[PDB]
């Protein structure tokens, strides 16, 4: 289980980072 | 062999000829004819819009001069491009858009002579703030009384672009005529050159707005911000703490907490930054 | 499967052809659907009677076709024939399309059933009947090569009107979906070069079907070479899905083409490239795709 | 919501009367009730026998179940594009066809921790060991709570744990029960 979780924590980290960019990206563009 | 959902292709210079002619005689119901090209069954285009010499009658079939138009159309065959009329227009400054008592008759005379002849209504006294209420319409026959009007078949854009308001469905919608959607034929070789000649300044982007009135503007704003700060002081020290969340929501002012507090403060901050940075750059450049 | 059955032939030999081509798997599925059935009739009546003189006959006949897909039962085209034939111009088109949807898969029985409605003998002045018929024959005979691709080929070579050139090419493209035959590819090109602005969505959908996941070196160029100088929006939208459907799962082999469609100022082509980047990326957690897909959304 | 019962999620009958309320109302849009009449046909598609899935049996993806749904997304611009959604209709049968024609009628059951679900009955209002034959549907979520017959000698070769098609490793003599309508 110690190898199976470690990629899963990467996938949750990578899925988070595209989101938190995009919500910073949208809220920059939402001001117009 | 029936309509589904037509789309009117107007050009950029078409609407510009519409507003200037509509603004020209506002209290005299300007009247002209619309010239385009039927390209297929249910898309229609119009690029070139000319005006008609008006009369004492006003918007009617009698103000449409036949001998002037054919003299005009013949002279347009050699210069530019020859094509056939596809409709007409008039202006209703007194109200919104609906087909008047004689507008429906001259519609019948045009769709009996030409094919379908879409009529455009532009309100010049309304096209003021940032928007125009231009709308075009098209007559349906009175023979389809047992079938539902607007024979839509394979489309779902009809819920868009306008819904029929209360001021529209009272006169003739939908039992006499129907509404039509109009999009804007935008392209290159028109759009960027309109922006670069209207909203563009070369020498103005590096001026200095000399500091007689500039630092003077940084003084009338400090005083009213101070009084708002003292008023902001007055509310923050006050702090009603009997039922706070209901007292806060039934007593809002929309000017005390952060409305008038950082609005002018932001404006004075950005202005001197732009002014000093433009002042520093010219000192870097000019020797 | 088309590759191995060419390598296989290079009795138990005839048995292993049929189970690697697939006739009985259609049949036992067809046997499964004709046995088991649960469709209530009352609800369809309570939806039927609340329909006014609007356009909702197409909405009904698309609904029953969805809930009788493969059931192969004709009851609504039998109990009220006059109510179905009330509306026109596409309601006869959609219903005879829906007749094929209920008979999803016979591979012979629908061909001998719909042999009654010939495309020269139904009505001389109703091409929506024969056009929806050739559309319906393409729905039933899908992913099944043979004479039917060639038999629908001979009918498109001699077409009467442009209504029939819709459901003919839509029927032919779905029959040849994933085949990449040169003959259907040659006639679908010259159909697009006919320059007719009612059938571009008929040709544009069909060209993506016969070239589904193909990455041709000339199809994408000829489609994006055609959809610049035209003058309609259907012809933009027909080729829009076709250049999206031509690639499927390339995963790095469209990235310049995705950039080529998105940098363009064409709103349809920017819309079309969003489908193409979606179809090349399926089940794939590419962060850079969804970064680029969301940044262009807002 | 496809082949789902009340024990699967409670909002089904909530949504069925909601579909009904917007389709029996007169003062609505046609575009509103077009969504409801479409919701009627998708909820009961194929008589609770077919379902939609981009996913195949063994991790592979379908091509025609993707082509069907994406042209269905273009239903604003052309209404007969909705016919193409039928390609994504996938069966939920489990047929134990061992020979090219031999369809024996093997009576297998399942083992549900609650009581019965899985193929409701039509309305008209103006144990957990139920045996099942080979041409019978199965809910795609009860594929792991089933059980092949251990009291019968006829046992399959592939382990029955996922809906699809399997064979019956015939072991006895004197085979019978063939039926085709
Ligand atoms: Zn008027």
**Concatenated DSSP letters of D16-63:** HHHHHHHHH-SSS-HHHHHHHHHHHHHHTGGGTTEEE-SB-TTS-B-S
Please tell me which of the candidates C42, C59, C93 has its beta carbon nearest to residue D37.
C59
Element containing residue B125 per DSSP (H, E): none
Start-to-end CA span in chain C (Å): 43
Inter-residue contact D92 to D50 (CB < 8 Å) = yes
Give the CB-side neighbour count of residue B171, counting CA atoms within 13 A: 17
Nearest-CA residue of chain B relative to C59? B153
Annotate C190-212 with three-state secondary structure: HHHCCCCCCCHHHHHHHHHHHCC
Distance CA B129, CA C37 (A): 62
Nearest to B96 by CA among B132, B64, B55, B60: B132
B117 C-alpha vs ligand 1 centroid, how far in Å? 14
Residues of D with CB under 8 A from a CB of B: 29, 31, 75-80
CA separation for the pair D141, C10 (Å, rounded):
43
Chain C: closest CA distance from residue D70 (Å): 9
DSSP B204: G
Query: Order of strands across the sheet with B7-10?
Result: B177-179, B135-139, B118-122, B84-91, B31-38, B43-51, B7-10, B181-184
Q: Using the beta-carbon criterion (under 8 Å), do C90 and B151 form an inter-chain contact?
A: no
Chain D residues whose beta carbon lies within 8 Å of the beta carbon of residue C89 = none
Hey, what are B122's tokens? 């532009």
Q: Tell me whether residue B103 is annotated as binding.
A: yes
The residue assigned the tokens 């210079």 is B13
Q: What is the per-residue DSSP string for D106-120?
A: --BEE--SSS--SS-
Q: Do chains D and C touch (3 or more CB pairs under 8 A)?
A: yes
> Residue D86 is nearest to which of C50, C69, C237, comparing CB atoms?
C69
Distance of CA C131 to the CA centre of its chain: 13
CA–chain centroid gap for C56, Å, is 23
Query: Which residues of chain B lie closer than 8 angstroms to D78, CB-CB?
Result: 154
Helix (H, G, I), strand (E, B) or coil at B64: coil
- Short-list D35, D33, D14, CA closest to D22: D33
Tokens 């077009």 sit on residue: D34
Cα(D27)–Cα(D31) distance, integer angstroms: 12
Q: Which residues of D touch C72 (CB under 8 A)?
A: none
**C61 — contact with chain D (CB < 8 Å)?**
no
**Is residue B149 annotated as involved in ligand binding?**
no
Give the separation between CA A25 and CA D166, rounded to whole angstroms. Answer: 51
* HSE value, Cβ hemisphere, 13 Å, CA-based, for C178: 12
- CA separation for the pair D66, D87 (Å, rounded): 9
Strand locations in chain B, DSSP E?
A: 7-10, 31-38, 43-51, 84-91, 118-122, 135-139, 177-179, 181-184
Distances (CA, A) of B28 to B33, B59, B97, C88, C236: 16, 9, 16, 46, 43
Contact between residue D94 and residue D166 where contact means Cβ atoms under 8 Å apart? yes
With 0-12 CB in 10 A as exposed, 13-18 as middle and 19+ as buried, what is D123? exposed
**Of C51, C53, C55, which to mutate for an interface test with B (greatest number of B Cβ within 10 Å)?**
C55
Facing C295 at nearest CB: one of A11, A17, A25: A25
Q: For tokens 């994406």, what's the residue?
A: D70
User: Which residue of C53, C89, C231 is in closest CB contact with B148?
Assistant: C53
Cα distances from C97 to residues B62, C94, D49, in angstroms, run: 51, 5, 22
- Contact yes or no for C134/C168 (Cβ under 8 A): yes
Nearest-Cα distance to chain C for D38, in Å, is 6
Kindly provide the resolution of this structure in angstroms, with one decimal. Answer: 3.6
Residue count (chain B): 287
Per-residue CA distances from B156 to B5, B174, B207, C89, D38 (Å): 10, 18, 52, 17, 14
Q: Is C252 helix (H, G, I), strand (E, B) or coil?
A: coil
| CA nearest neighbour of D83 among C103, C40, C78, C88 | C103
Kindly give the interhelix angle for C287-295 and C267-279, rounded to the nearest 10 degrees: 160
Task: Please give the helix or strand (H or E) that residue C37 lies within, else none.
Answer: none
- On whether the CB atoms of residues C148 and C112 are closer than 8 A, the answer is no
State the chains in contact with C (3 or more Cβ–Cβ pairs under 8 Å). A, B, D
Cβ of A26 within 8 Å of Cβ of C290? The answer is no
CA distance C245 to D81: 15
Look at residue B113 and give its three-state secondary structure. Answer: helix
DSSP D79: G
Q: Within 10 A of B110 (CB to CB), how many other CB atoms are there?
A: 23
Q: CA triplet B147, B150, B154: central angle to 5 degrees? A: 105
Which residue of chain C has the CA closest to D84?
C139
Q: And the tokens for B102? A: 């004689």
Q: Minimal CA–CA distance to C6: which of C145, C149, C185?
A: C145
As given in the structure block, the two tokens for residue C178 are 């994933």
β-partners of residue B137 are B119, B179
Q: What token pair was written down for B105?
A: 């008759």
Contact: B159, D80; criterion CB under 8 Å: no
Residue B11 phi, psi dihedral angles, 5° rounding: -100, 170
Rounded Cα distance, B227 and B165, in Å: 47
* Contact yes or no for D78 and B154 at CB 8 A: yes
Rounded distance, CA C269 to CA C262, Å? 7
Q: What is the DSSP string of B205-270?
A: GG----TTTHHHHHHHHHHHHHHHHHHHHHHHHH---SSHHHHHHHS--SSTTTTSSSHHHHHHHH
After which residues, if any, is chain C broken (C to N > 2.5 Å)?
10
- Residues of chain C in contact with residue D180, where contact means CB-CB under 8 angstroms, are 31
Query: Distance between terminal CA atoms of chain B?
Result: 77
Q: Alpha helices of C20-175 — where are they, by DSSP H?
A: 24-35, 41-48, 57-67, 76-79, 81-84, 91-102, 109-113, 127-140, 147-157, 164-175
Residue that is written with structure tokens 């059951």 in the block: D109
DSSP element (H, E) containing D91? strand D89-91
Number of other CB atoms surrounding residue C149 within 10 Å: 20
Express the helix, strand and coil content of chain B in percent, nearest 5 each: 35, 15, 45
Helix (H) or strand (E) holding D94: strand D94-96
Tell me how far apart the alpha carbons of residues C16 and B89 are, in angstroms, rounded to a whole number. 73
**Breaks in chain D listed by the residue before each, with C–N > 2.5 Å:** 126
Residues of C in contact with A17 (CB under 8 A): 287
Tell which residue, B59, B67, B5, B10, has the closest CA to residue B35: B10
Give the contacts of B279 (CB within 8 A, at least 6 positions apart).
Answer: B208
User: What are the φ/ψ torsions at residue B250 (nearest 5 degrees)?
Assistant: -90, -15
Beta bridge partners of D27: none
Q: What residues contact D27, with CB distance under 8 A and at least 6 apart?
A: none
Chain B: give the shortest CA distance to residue C53, in Å: 6
Q: Does the CB of B282 have a partner CB in chain C at under 8 Å?
A: no
Classified as helix, coil or strand, C168 is helix
* Experimental method of this PDB entry: cryo-EM
Containing H/E element for D89? strand D89-91
- Was B90 annotated as part of a binding site? yes
A and D touch with 3+ CB pairs <8 Å, answer: no
Contact in structure between D107 and D124 (CB atoms under 8 Å): no
What's the gap in Å between B120 CA and the centre of ligand 1?
9
Q: In 10 A of CB D170, how many CB atoms?
A: 14
Could you tell me if residue C215 is left (phi over 0), alpha (psi between -120 and 50 degrees) or otherwise beta? left
Rounded CA gap, D126 and C47, in Å?
13
Distance CA C165, CA C134 (A): 9
Bridge partner list, D137 = D93
Nearest CA in chain D to B156: D76
Which two tokens mark B116?
């379908």
Supply C86's token pair: 């009330």
> Taking CB atoms and an 8 Å cutoff, what residues of chain C touch A21?
291
Using DSSP, state whether D81 is helix, strand or coil.
Answer: helix
Cα-Cα-Cα-Cα torsion B62, B64, B70, B75, nearest 10 degrees, comes to 150
Across the interface, of A14, A26, A29, the residue whose CB is closest to C287 is A14
- Here the tokens at position C296 are 């262009």
CB D126 within 8 A of CB D87: no
Task: Please report the sign of the dihedral spanned by the C-alpha atoms of residue D51, residue D57, residue D59, residue D63.
Answer: negative
- B106 burial (CB, 10 Å; 0-12 / 13-18 / 19+) is buried
CB burial string D84-117: b at 16+ within 10 A, e below = bbbbbbbbbbbbbbbeeeebbebebebebeeeee
In eight-state DSSP terms, residue B190 is T
Q: Does C20 touch chain D (CB under 8 A)?
A: no
The C-alpha atoms of residue B259 and residue D107 are separated, in whole angstroms, by: 75
CB contact under 8 A, B40 and C197: yes
Distances (CA, A) of C99 to B137, B170, C94: 38, 42, 9
Task: Determine the residue of chain C that is closest to D59 in CA distance.
Answer: C283
- The dihedrals phi and psi of C240, each to the nearest 5 degrees, come to -65, -45
Write out the two tokens for C42. 């009352």
Instruction: Please work out, in degrees rounded to the nearest 5, the angle formed at the alpha carbon of residue D61 by the alpha carbons of D57 and D64.
Output: 105
Q: Bridge partners of D95?
A: D165
What is the C-alpha to C-alpha distance for residues C4 and C17, in angstroms, rounded to an integer?
Answer: 10
Yes or no, beta carbons of C287 and A18 under 8 Å apart: yes
Facing residue for A11 by CB, picked from C285, C294, C295: C285
Q: Are B216 and B172 in contact (CB under 8 A)?
A: no
Residue C214 phi, psi (nearest 5): -110, -40
* Phi–psi pair at B92, nearest 5 degrees: -115, 90
Q: Suggest the residue from B159, B160, B163 to mutate for an interface test with chain D (most D CBs closer than 10 A).
A: B159
Residues of C contacting chain B (CB within 8 angstroms): 52-55, 58, 88-90, 197-198, 231-233, 265
C214, C252 in Cβ contact below 8 A? no
Tokens, residue D147: 């059980």
Question: How far away, in angstroms, is B160 Cα from ligand 1 center?
Answer: 25
First to last CA, chain A: 48
Query: What is the least distance, in Å, from the CA of C294 to any CA of chain A?
Result: 7
Rounded Cα distance between B136 and B116, Å, is 12
Say whether residue B212 is in contact with chain C using an 8 A CB cutoff. Answer: no
Structure-token pair, residue C158: 């001699």
- Do the Cβ atoms of C33 and D49 come closer than 8 Å? yes
DSSP code at position C27: H
C14 interfaces chain A, CB cutoff of 8 Å: no
- As a whole number of angstroms, the distance between CA C159 and CA C166 comes to 10
The backbone torsions φ and ψ at residue C28, rounded to the nearest 5 degrees and listed phi first, read -65, -30
Cα(B109) to ligand 1 centroid in Å equals: 15
Q: Is C282 part of the contact surface with chain A (CB cutoff 8 Å)?
A: no
What is the rounded CA–CA span in Å between residue C286 and residue C296?
A: 16
Strands D146-147 and D164-166: unpaired
Beta bridge partners of B43: B7
CB contact under 8 A, C287 and A17: yes
User: CA B156 to CA B143: how far, in whole Å?
Assistant: 26
CA distance C224 to C260: 10
Rounded to whole angstroms, how far apart are CA atoms B114 and B88?
Answer: 11
How many Å lie between the alpha carbon of B153 and the closest alpha carbon of chain C? 7
Measured CA distances, D179 to C31, C36, D89, D103, D176 (Å): 11, 14, 26, 8, 10
The CA–CA distances, whole Å, from B201 to B188, B204, C250, C284 equal: 21, 6, 47, 48
Neighbouring C-beta atoms of residue B59, cutoff 10 Å: 22
Non-local (6+) Cβ contacts of A9 within 8 A are none
Chain-centroid distance of CA B284 in Å reads: 45
* Whole-Å CA distances, D54 to B29, C277, D60, D68: 61, 17, 9, 10
Our separate counts of H helices and E strands in chain B read: 7, 8
Which of C71, C32, C19 has the alpha carbon at shortest distance from D138? C32
- The set of chains that have 3 or more CB pairs under 8 A with B is C, D
Helix (H) or strand (E) holding B192: helix B191-198
Compute the 3-state secondary structure of chain A and give helix, strand, coil in percent, each to the nearest 5: 85, 0, 15
Asked if the Cβ–Cβ distance from B153 to C90 is below 8 Å, we say yes
Chain D residues whose beta carbon lies within 8 Å of the beta carbon of residue C90: 79-80
What token pair was written down for B260?
Answer: 């008038």
Question: What distance in angstroms lies between residue B58's CA and the mean position of ligand 1's atoms?
Answer: 10
- What is the distance between the alpha carbons of residues B120 and B33, in angstroms, rounded to a whole number? 10
């Amino acid at each position: 289980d110690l190898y199976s979780r470690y990629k899963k924590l990467q996938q949750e980290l990578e899925f988070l980072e595209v989101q938190e960019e995009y919500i910073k990206d949208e809220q920059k563009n939402l001001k117009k | 062999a029936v309509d589904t959902a037509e789309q009117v292709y107007i050009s950029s210079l078409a609407l510009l000829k519409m507003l200037k002619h509509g603004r020209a005689g506002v209290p005299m119901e300007v009247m002209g004819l619309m010239l385009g090209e039927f390209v297929d069954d249910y898309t229609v285009r119009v690029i070139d819009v000319f005006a008609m010499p008006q009369s004492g009658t006003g918007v009617s079939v009698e103000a449409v001069d036949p001998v002037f138009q054919a003299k005009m159309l013949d002279m347009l065959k050699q210069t530019g491009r020859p094509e056939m009329v596809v409709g007409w227009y008039h202006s209703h400054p007194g109200f919104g858009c609906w087909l008047s008592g004689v507008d429906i008759n001259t519609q019948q005379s045009f769709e009996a002579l030409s094919e379908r002849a879409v009529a455009v209504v532009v309100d010049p006294i309304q096209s003021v703030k940032g928007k125009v209420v231009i709308d075009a319409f098209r007559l349906i026959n009175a023979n389809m009384m047992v079938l539902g009007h607007e024979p839509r078949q394979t489309t779902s854009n009809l819920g868009h672009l306008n819904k029929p308001s209360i001021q529209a469905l009272i006169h003739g919608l939908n039992r006499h005529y129907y509404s039509i959607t109009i999009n804007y034929r935008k392209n290159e070789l028109e759009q960027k050159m309109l922006l670069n000649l209207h909203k563009k300044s070369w020498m103005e982007g590096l001026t200095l707005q000399d500091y007689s009135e500039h630092c003077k503007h940084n003084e009338s704003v400090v005083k009213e911000m101070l009084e708002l700060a003292k008023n902001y002081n007055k509310a923050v020290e006050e702090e009603d703490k009997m039922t706070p969340e209901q007292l806060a929501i039934k007593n809002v002012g929309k000017q005390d907490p952060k409305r008038h507090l950082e609005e002018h403060v932001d404006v004075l901050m950005t202005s001197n930054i732009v002014q000093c940075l433009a002042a520093m750059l010219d000192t870097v450049v000019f020797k | 499967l088309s590759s191995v059955i060419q390598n296989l032939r290079t009795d138990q030999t005839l048995k292993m052809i049929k189970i690697l081509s697939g006739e009985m798997a259609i049949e036992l599925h067809l046997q499964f659907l004709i046995r088991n059935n649960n469709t209530d009739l009352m609800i369809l009546k309570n939806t039927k009677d609340a329909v006014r003189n609007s356009v909702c006959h197409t909405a009904t006949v698309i609904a029953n076709s969805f809930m009788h897909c493969g059931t192969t039962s004709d009851q609504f085209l039998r109990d009220n024939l006059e109510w179905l034939a009330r509306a026109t111009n596409w309601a006869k088109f959609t219903a005879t399309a829906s007749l094929g949807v209920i008979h999803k898969g016979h591979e012979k029985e629908a061909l001998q059933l719909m042999a009654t409605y010939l495309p020269k003998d139904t009505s001389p002045g109703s091409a929506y009947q024969e056009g929806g018929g050739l559309y319906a024959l393409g729905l039933i005979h899908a992913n099944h090569g043979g004479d039917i691709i060639d038999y629908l080929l001979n009918q498109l070579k001699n077409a009467s009107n442009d209504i029939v050139r819709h459901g003919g090419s839509l029927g032919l493209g779905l029959a040849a979906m994933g085949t990449a035959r040169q003959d259907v590819y040659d006639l679908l090109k010259t159909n697009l070069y006919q320059d007719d602005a009612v059938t571009g969505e008929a040709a544009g959908l069909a060209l993506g079907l016969v070239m589904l996941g193909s990455k041709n070196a000339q199809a994408i160029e000829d489609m994006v070479g055609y959809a610049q100088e035209t003058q309609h929006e259907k012809i933009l939208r027909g080729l829009a899905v076709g250049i999206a459907l031509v690639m499927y799962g390339r995963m790095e082999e469209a990235d310049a083409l995705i950039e080529s469609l998105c940098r363009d100022k064409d709103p349809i082509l920017r819309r079309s490239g969003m489908y193409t980047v979606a179809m090349a990326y399926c089940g794939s957690g590419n962060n850079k795709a969804i970064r680029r897909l969301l940044h262009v959304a807002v | 919501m496809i082949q789902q019962t009340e024990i699967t999620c409670p909002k089904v009958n909530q949504f069925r009367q909601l579909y009904s309320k917007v389709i029996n109302d007169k003062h609505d849009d046609v575009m509103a009730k077009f969504g409801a009449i479409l919701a009627q046909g998708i909820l009961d598609a194929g008589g609770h026998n077919v379902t939609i899935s981009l996913q195949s049996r063994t991790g592979h993806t379908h091509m025609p179940s993707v082509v069907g749904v994406l042209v269905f997304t273009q239903f604003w611009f052309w209404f007969p594009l909705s016919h193409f959604l039928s390609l994504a209709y996938t069966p939920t049968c489990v047929i134990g066809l061992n020979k090219d024609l031999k369809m024996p009628k093997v009576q297998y059951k399942s083992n549900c921790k609650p009581s019965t679900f899985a193929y409701p009955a039509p309305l008209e209002v103006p144990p957990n060991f139920q045996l099942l034959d080979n041409p019978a549907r199965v809910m795609p979520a009860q594929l792991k709570v089933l059980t092949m017959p251990e009291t019968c000698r006829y046992q399959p070769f592939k382990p029955l744990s996922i809906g699809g098609i399997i064979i019956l490793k015939d072991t006895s003599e004197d085979i019978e029960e063939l039926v085709e309508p």
